[PDB]
Structure 1
Protein backbone atom coordinates (compact mmCIF):
# COMPACT_ATOMS: atom_id res chain seq x y z
CA UNK A 1 0.00 0.00 0.00
CA UNK A 2 1.13 3.56 -0.78
CA UNK A 3 0.12 6.38 1.57
CA UNK A 4 0.19 9.95 0.31
CA UNK A 5 1.13 12.68 2.82
CA UNK A 6 0.44 16.22 1.67
CA UNK A 7 2.92 18.91 2.69
CA UNK A 8 0.84 21.98 3.59
CA UNK A 9 -2.94 21.83 4.21
CA UNK A 10 -5.28 23.19 1.49
CA UNK A 11 -5.86 26.18 3.78
CA UNK A 12 -2.10 26.86 3.84
CA UNK A 13 -1.56 25.66 7.40
CA UNK A 14 1.93 24.22 7.90
CA UNK A 15 0.90 20.61 8.48
CA UNK A 16 1.65 17.19 7.12
CA UNK A 17 -1.68 15.62 6.16
CA UNK A 18 -2.24 13.02 7.49
CA UNK A 19 0.32 13.64 10.25
CA UNK A 20 0.19 10.06 11.55
CA UNK A 21 0.43 7.04 9.27
CA UNK A 22 0.68 3.35 10.19
CA UNK A 23 2.45 1.12 7.69
CA UNK A 24 3.12 -2.55 7.27
CA UNK A 25 6.25 -4.17 5.83
CA UNK A 26 6.66 -3.24 2.15
CA UNK A 27 4.36 -0.21 2.23
CA UNK A 28 5.41 3.16 0.78
CA UNK A 29 4.91 6.66 2.18
CA UNK A 30 5.02 9.39 -0.42
CA UNK A 31 5.25 13.07 0.60
CA UNK A 32 3.96 15.57 -1.93
CA UNK A 33 4.15 19.39 -1.89
CA UNK A 34 0.59 20.69 -1.64
CA UNK A 35 0.58 24.30 -0.35
CA UNK A 36 3.13 27.03 0.51
CA UNK A 37 6.47 25.35 -0.30
CA UNK A 38 9.29 24.94 0.43
CA UNK A 39 9.06 22.09 2.90
CA UNK A 40 11.49 19.33 3.77
CA UNK A 41 11.41 16.04 5.70
CA UNK A 42 13.86 15.54 8.58
CA UNK A 43 13.68 12.49 10.78
CA UNK A 44 14.49 13.16 14.43
CA UNK A 45 17.48 10.93 15.25
CA UNK A 46 16.38 10.70 18.92
CA UNK A 47 12.90 9.47 17.84
CA UNK A 48 13.52 6.65 15.40
CA UNK A 49 14.34 3.05 16.39
CA UNK A 50 17.71 2.74 18.13
CA UNK A 51 17.80 6.53 18.27
CA UNK A 52 20.08 6.10 15.23
CA UNK A 53 21.49 9.14 13.47
CA UNK A 54 22.47 6.97 10.53
CA UNK A 55 18.89 5.75 10.13
CA UNK A 56 17.45 9.26 10.50
CA UNK A 57 19.91 10.64 7.95
CA UNK A 58 19.10 7.75 5.54
CA UNK A 59 15.39 8.52 5.67
CA UNK A 60 15.56 12.32 5.55
CA UNK A 61 15.09 14.53 2.53
CA UNK A 62 17.04 17.52 3.85
CA UNK A 63 17.05 19.46 0.57
CA UNK A 64 14.23 22.00 0.50
CA UNK A 65 11.44 21.04 -1.91
CA UNK A 66 10.30 24.18 -3.76
CA UNK A 67 8.28 22.85 -6.67
CA UNK A 68 4.51 22.39 -6.67
CA UNK A 69 3.73 18.68 -6.34
CA UNK A 70 7.43 17.77 -5.74
CA UNK A 71 7.55 14.33 -4.07
CA UNK A 72 9.75 12.18 -1.92
CA UNK A 73 9.06 8.60 -0.92
CA UNK A 74 10.22 5.84 1.39
CA UNK A 75 9.40 2.15 1.01
CA UNK A 76 9.47 0.55 4.48
CA UNK A 77 11.18 -2.78 3.65
CA UNK A 78 13.37 -5.00 5.86
CA UNK A 79 16.27 -2.55 6.45
CA UNK A 80 13.76 -0.43 8.45
CA UNK A 81 13.10 -1.74 12.00
CA UNK A 82 9.63 -1.84 13.60
CA UNK A 83 8.70 1.16 15.70
CA UNK A 84 7.78 4.80 15.41
CA UNK A 85 9.62 7.39 13.32
CA UNK A 86 9.01 11.06 14.16
CA UNK A 87 9.84 13.69 11.54
CA UNK A 88 9.45 17.39 10.95
CA UNK A 89 9.75 20.14 8.36
CA UNK A 90 12.71 22.41 9.19
CA UNK A 91 11.13 25.57 7.74
CA UNK A 92 7.99 25.11 9.83
CA UNK A 93 9.25 23.14 12.82
CA UNK A 94 8.50 26.07 15.16
CA UNK A 95 4.88 26.12 13.98
CA UNK A 96 4.46 22.39 14.64
CA UNK A 97 4.82 20.93 11.12
CA UNK A 98 5.56 17.42 12.42
CA UNK A 99 4.52 13.85 11.63
CA UNK A 100 4.95 10.27 12.76
CA UNK A 101 5.17 6.98 10.85
CA UNK A 102 4.41 3.81 12.85
CA UNK A 103 6.05 0.73 11.27
CA UNK A 104 4.19 -2.38 12.42
CA UNK A 105 5.72 -5.82 12.96
Structure 2
Protein backbone atom coordinates (compact mmCIF):
# COMPACT_ATOMS: atom_id res chain seq x y z
CA UNK A 1 0.00 0.00 0.00
CA UNK A 2 1.11 3.57 -0.62
CA UNK A 3 0.24 6.22 1.94
CA UNK A 4 0.20 9.85 0.87
CA UNK A 5 1.39 12.69 3.10
CA UNK A 6 0.80 16.29 2.12
CA UNK A 7 3.61 18.78 2.70
CA UNK A 8 1.68 21.83 3.89
CA UNK A 9 -1.95 21.59 5.11
CA UNK A 10 -4.69 22.30 2.52
CA UNK A 11 -5.65 25.39 4.55
CA UNK A 12 -2.13 26.87 4.50
CA UNK A 13 -0.32 25.68 7.60
CA UNK A 14 3.22 24.38 8.02
CA UNK A 15 2.24 20.74 8.70
CA UNK A 16 2.61 17.26 7.34
CA UNK A 17 -0.95 15.98 6.72
CA UNK A 18 -1.49 13.50 8.28
CA UNK A 19 1.25 13.88 10.89
CA UNK A 20 1.50 10.21 11.85
CA UNK A 21 1.31 7.20 9.48
CA UNK A 22 1.66 3.47 10.20
CA UNK A 23 3.01 1.20 7.50
CA UNK A 24 4.02 -2.44 6.93
CA UNK A 25 7.35 -3.43 5.43
CA UNK A 26 7.06 -3.19 1.60
CA UNK A 27 4.70 -0.22 1.84
CA UNK A 28 5.52 3.20 0.43
CA UNK A 29 5.13 6.65 1.90
CA UNK A 30 4.66 9.33 -0.79
CA UNK A 31 5.06 13.00 0.10
CA UNK A 32 3.26 15.46 -2.18
CA UNK A 33 4.17 19.15 -2.15
CA UNK A 34 0.85 20.77 -1.20
CA UNK A 35 0.89 24.32 0.21
CA UNK A 36 3.41 26.98 1.22
CA UNK A 37 6.53 25.49 -0.35
CA UNK A 38 9.42 24.98 -0.12
CA UNK A 39 9.64 22.01 2.19
CA UNK A 40 12.10 19.22 2.72
CA UNK A 41 12.16 15.89 4.61
CA UNK A 42 14.86 15.31 7.24
CA UNK A 43 14.81 12.23 9.48
CA UNK A 44 15.96 12.79 13.06
CA UNK A 45 18.95 10.50 13.68
CA UNK A 46 18.02 10.30 17.36
CA UNK A 47 14.49 9.06 16.53
CA UNK A 48 14.92 6.37 13.92
CA UNK A 49 15.44 2.74 14.89
CA UNK A 50 19.07 2.07 15.83
CA UNK A 51 19.66 5.84 16.21
CA UNK A 52 21.62 5.74 12.98
CA UNK A 53 22.71 8.87 11.11
CA UNK A 54 23.34 6.66 8.08
CA UNK A 55 19.75 5.38 8.10
CA UNK A 56 18.37 8.90 8.66
CA UNK A 57 20.50 10.26 5.72
CA UNK A 58 19.37 7.44 3.41
CA UNK A 59 15.72 8.23 4.06
CA UNK A 60 15.97 12.02 3.89
CA UNK A 61 15.28 14.33 0.98
CA UNK A 62 17.41 17.22 2.21
CA UNK A 63 17.00 19.34 -0.93
CA UNK A 64 14.12 21.85 -0.86
CA UNK A 65 11.04 21.00 -2.94
CA UNK A 66 9.38 24.08 -4.53
CA UNK A 67 6.92 22.87 -7.17
CA UNK A 68 3.31 22.35 -6.13
CA UNK A 69 2.51 18.68 -6.63
CA UNK A 70 6.08 17.38 -6.84
CA UNK A 71 6.76 14.28 -4.82
CA UNK A 72 9.26 12.18 -2.91
CA UNK A 73 8.69 8.52 -1.97
CA UNK A 74 10.27 5.97 0.36
CA UNK A 75 9.44 2.29 0.07
CA UNK A 76 10.14 0.63 3.40
CA UNK A 77 12.17 -2.38 2.28
CA UNK A 78 13.44 -5.11 4.60
CA UNK A 79 16.81 -3.39 4.99
CA UNK A 80 14.98 -0.75 7.08
CA UNK A 81 14.31 -1.80 10.66
CA UNK A 82 10.80 -1.89 12.15
CA UNK A 83 10.14 0.86 14.68
CA UNK A 84 9.33 4.54 14.64
CA UNK A 85 10.88 7.16 12.37
CA UNK A 86 10.44 10.83 13.26
CA UNK A 87 11.15 13.51 10.62
CA UNK A 88 10.80 17.26 10.09
CA UNK A 89 10.87 20.04 7.54
CA UNK A 90 14.05 22.11 8.14
CA UNK A 91 12.75 25.57 7.25
CA UNK A 92 9.57 24.95 9.30
CA UNK A 93 10.91 22.85 12.13
CA UNK A 94 10.28 25.60 14.73
CA UNK A 95 6.78 26.08 13.36
CA UNK A 96 6.15 22.44 14.35
CA UNK A 97 6.31 20.86 10.89
CA UNK A 98 7.09 17.38 12.20
CA UNK A 99 5.84 13.88 11.40
CA UNK A 100 6.30 10.23 12.26
CA UNK A 101 6.20 6.94 10.37
CA UNK A 102 5.70 3.76 12.35
CA UNK A 103 6.93 0.64 10.55
CA UNK A 104 5.12 -2.31 12.11
CA UNK A 105 6.66 -5.63 11.15
Same fold per superposition (TM over 0.5): yes
Task: State how far apart, in whole Å, the 2-side matches of 1:60 and 1:66 are.
Answer: 16
> What TM-score do the two structures reach when normalised by structure 2?
0.99
Specify the SS of the correspondent of 1:14.
Answer: strand
Task: State how far apart, in whole Å, the 2-side matches of 1:87 and 1:29 are.
Answer: 13
What is the CA deviation profile of residues 62-102 of structure 1, one whole-angstrom value per residue up to 9, with x for unaligned ones? Answer: 00001111100000010110000000000100000000000
1:11 Cα deviation after fit: 1.0
1:13 Cα deviation after fit: 0.4
> What TM-score do the two structures reach when normalised by structure 1?
0.99
Runs of 4+ in 1 over 4 A off after TM superposition: none
How many residues of Structure 1 are paired with residues of Structure 2 in the alignment?
105
What is the CA deviation profile of residues 26-65 of structure 1, one whole-angstrom value per residue up to 9, with x for unaligned ones? Answer: 0000000000100000000000011000000000000000
Q: Tell me the C-alpha RMSD between the 2 structures.
A: 0.4
For 2:90, the equivalent position in structure 1 comes to 90
Residue 5, structure 1, aligned to residue 5, structure 2: yes
Specify the SS of the correspondent of 2:58.
Answer: helix
1:10 Cα deviation after fit: 1.0
